[PDB]
Design a protein around this motif. Structure first.
Motif, mmCIF file in Angstrom:
data_model
loop_
_atom_site.group_PDB
_atom_site.id
_atom_site.type_symbol
_atom_site.label_atom_id
_atom_site.label_comp_id
_atom_site.label_asym_id
_atom_site.label_seq_id
_atom_site.Cartn_x
_atom_site.Cartn_y
_atom_site.Cartn_z
ATOM 1 N N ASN A 73 -38.663 -23.824 -31.398
ATOM 2 C CA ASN A 73 -38.429 -23.868 -29.960
ATOM 3 C C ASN A 73 -39.666 -24.364 -29.220
ATOM 4 O O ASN A 73 -39.637 -25.415 -28.578
ATOM 5 C CB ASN A 73 -38.025 -22.485 -29.440
ATOM 6 N N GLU A 74 -40.755 -23.600 -29.315
ATOM 7 C CA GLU A 74 -41.990 -23.979 -28.641
ATOM 8 C C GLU A 74 -42.678 -25.160 -29.311
ATOM 9 O O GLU A 74 -43.414 -25.892 -28.642
ATOM 10 C CB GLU A 74 -42.945 -22.787 -28.584
ATOM 11 N N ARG A 75 -42.455 -25.365 -30.612
ATOM 12 C CA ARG A 75 -43.081 -26.491 -31.296
ATOM 13 C C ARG A 75 -42.542 -27.823 -30.792
ATOM 14 O O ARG A 75 -43.285 -28.808 -30.728
ATOM 15 C CB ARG A 75 -42.875 -26.369 -32.806
ATOM 16 N N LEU A 76 -41.260 -27.871 -30.420
ATOM 17 C CA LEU A 76 -40.691 -29.103 -29.882
ATOM 18 C C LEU A 76 -41.338 -29.467 -28.551
ATOM 19 O O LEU A 76 -41.744 -30.617 -28.339
ATOM 20 C CB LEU A 76 -39.177 -28.955 -29.724
ATOM 21 N N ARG A 77 -41.436 -28.497 -27.638
ATOM 22 C CA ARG A 77 -42.125 -28.741 -26.377
ATOM 23 C C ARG A 77 -43.590 -29.083 -26.601
ATOM 24 O O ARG A 77 -44.153 -29.908 -25.874
ATOM 25 C CB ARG A 77 -41.996 -27.521 -25.464
ATOM 26 N N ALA A 78 -44.220 -28.473 -27.609
ATOM 27 C CA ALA A 78 -45.612 -28.783 -27.915
ATOM 28 C C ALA A 78 -45.766 -30.235 -28.349
ATOM 29 O O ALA A 78 -46.668 -30.941 -27.885
ATOM 30 C CB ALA A 78 -46.132 -27.838 -28.998
ATOM 31 N N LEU A 79 -44.887 -30.700 -29.239
ATOM 32 C CA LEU A 79 -44.953 -32.088 -29.688
ATOM 33 C C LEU A 79 -44.646 -33.053 -28.548
ATOM 34 O O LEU A 79 -45.265 -34.121 -28.443
ATOM 35 C CB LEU A 79 -43.992 -32.308 -30.854
ATOM 36 N N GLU A 80 -43.698 -32.693 -27.679
ATOM 37 C CA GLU A 80 -43.378 -33.550 -26.541
ATOM 38 C C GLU A 80 -44.566 -33.661 -25.592
ATOM 39 O O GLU A 80 -44.904 -34.756 -25.121
ATOM 40 C CB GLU A 80 -42.149 -33.010 -25.809
ATOM 41 N N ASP A 81 -45.215 -32.531 -25.302
ATOM 42 C CA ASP A 81 -46.404 -32.555 -24.461
ATOM 43 C C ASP A 81 -47.539 -33.319 -25.125
ATOM 44 O O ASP A 81 -48.307 -33.999 -24.441
ATOM 45 C CB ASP A 81 -46.843 -31.130 -24.130
ATOM 46 N N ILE A 82 -47.653 -33.235 -26.452
ATOM 47 C CA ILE A 82 -48.693 -33.977 -27.157
ATOM 48 C C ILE A 82 -48.451 -35.476 -27.043
ATOM 49 O O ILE A 82 -49.388 -36.256 -26.839
ATOM 50 C CB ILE A 82 -48.769 -33.525 -28.626
#
Lengths: 105, 35
Positions: free
Chosen positions: A1-10
């Protein structure tokens, strides 16, 4: 869940860092104010994006051996489908009984 | 011509070309980069 948003922000930050590096190079090579701070911020953002990419690549590597998480609760899906079918059949029978009652009265 | 010379050879303005060309190439590359 949070890893997807993390990769998108990266990815968004990597794009912004590329844009900032381009803009800083343009402002510094145009003529000779804030070009030094702009280049410093661009280099820092590029380093941060590289570090985030390296950290995401250095993940726990959950399985990497076979198809993981096999079984997406198909039993519950079928149970819900049967419950919906039961509800629909009950509604049809109730409508038939209501039509019969209306024809009676 | 160089290989032929390698036959018979012999010996016989504030433009600031590099100064303007540096800025020109910088702007040209920065345009595409920003785009």
């Amino acid at each position: 869940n949070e890893r997807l948003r993390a990769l998108e922000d990266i990815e968004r930050e990597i794009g912004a860092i590329l844009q900032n590096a381009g803009t800083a190079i343009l402002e510094l090579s145009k003529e000779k104010r804030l070009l030094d701070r702009q280049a410093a911020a661009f280099t820092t953002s590029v380093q941060h994006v590289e570090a985030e990419l390296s950290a995401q690549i250095r993940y726990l590597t959950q399985v990497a051996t076979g198809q993981p998480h096999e079984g997406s609760s198909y039993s519950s899906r079928k149970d819900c489908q049967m419950a919906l079918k039961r509800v629909d059949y009950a509604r049809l029978k109730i409508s038939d009984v209501a039509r019969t009652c209306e024809q009676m009265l | 011509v160089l290989s032929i010379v390698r036959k018979k050879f012999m010996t016989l303005s504030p433009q600031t070309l590099q100064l303007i060309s540096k800025k020109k190439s910088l702007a040209g590359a920065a345009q595409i980069l920003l785009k």
